[PDB]
Amino acid sequence: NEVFSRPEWMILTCLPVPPPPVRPSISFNESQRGEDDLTFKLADILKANISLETLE
Amino acid sequence: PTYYQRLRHMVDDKIHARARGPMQVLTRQPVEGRSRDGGLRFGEMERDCMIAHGAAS
Amino acid sequence: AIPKDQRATTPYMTKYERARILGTRALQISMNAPVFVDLEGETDPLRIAMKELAEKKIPLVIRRYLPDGSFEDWSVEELIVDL
DNA sequence: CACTCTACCGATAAGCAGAATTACCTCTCGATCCTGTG
RNA sequence: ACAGAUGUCCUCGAGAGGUA
């Protein structure tokens, strides 16, 4: 589609991050806090991007 | 006379009823299990049976 | 578009139509809304709705949609209730 | 008139991917180290 | 000049044993 879906948009150049409601944090046990797998994967992606930027 | 055994399944351990109980976090849907005051599940079979009945509302 | 009065649907009321009008009228009477019949000692909104429908005193209009998109309006009083 | 590969489709044969009834009850565990430090 | 506490539900992925 000319406006709705162009072929050049198929390459990911900007990655949106889901809001906290999409990936909430569980209660875990008492005095313990954990994060969803989405948060850890997003942090890994951000670390990889930062490493690539610094290396370039 | 006839020998009879009492099984482990009793009605007192299976009766459940919910009306606006605890909420979930992710999907904001009723929780699972009787011990957690959960709600009954409306499956796809119930949905299509109600479709066949014609009760859209 | 509306098919004038050269309508070609059925001159009777379907079961789904009967249920929908009965439910809408029951809800309207359950809320504070005027009643156009003699309650005569009835206090359940659904029974009041059936009493209103007995002599076709319900001011409701049925809009039957054709699959193409056209629709023809049928009055409740002009719909035969045989079921 | 068949001499040699050039362009065409019609079979055959191995590699991927999905997906497997519905509802309910109970218990039981696991959500991290060590080489490198002052 | 002023100002010391409370808001109710937390698991989650799995595994096993069973009921129609």
For C5, half-sphere exposure in the C-beta direction (CA atoms, 13 angstrom radius) is: 2
Continuous segment of H or E residues that includes residue A45: helix A37-55
A24 CB neighbours in chain B (<8 A) are 25-26
- Any alpha helices (H) in C8-72, and if so which ranges? 15-30, 45-54
Q: Which long-range contacts link B37-41 to residues 24+ away (Cβ below 8 Å)?
A: B40/B16
Which of these, C41, C43, C48, lies nearest to C22 by C-alpha position?
C48
Which value in Å is the resolution of this experimental model?
2.8
Instruction: Give the gap in angstroms from C-alpha A56 to the nearest C-alpha of chain B.
Output: 39
Across the interface, whether the CB atoms of C16 and B57 are under 8 A apart is answered no
Q: Which fold has domain C1-83?
A: Eukaryotic RPB6 RNA polymerase subunit (3.90.940)
Could you give the CA distance from residue C3 to residue C72 in angstroms, rounded to a whole number? 5
Could you give the CA distance from residue A4 to residue C67 in angstroms, rounded to a whole number? 29
Q: How far are the Cα atoms of C35, C37, C52 from residue C40, in angstroms, in the given order?
A: 12, 9, 12
In the structure encoding, which two tokens stand for residue B46, read together?
A: 């119930």
B25 CB neighbours in chain A (<8 A) are 24, 26
Q: Identify the residue whose tokens are 């009766």.
A: B15
Per-domain residue ranges for chain C?
A: 1-83
In the structure encoding, which two tokens stand for residue C8, read together?
A: 């070609």
Could you give the CA distance from residue C23 to residue B24 in angstroms, rounded to a whole number? 33
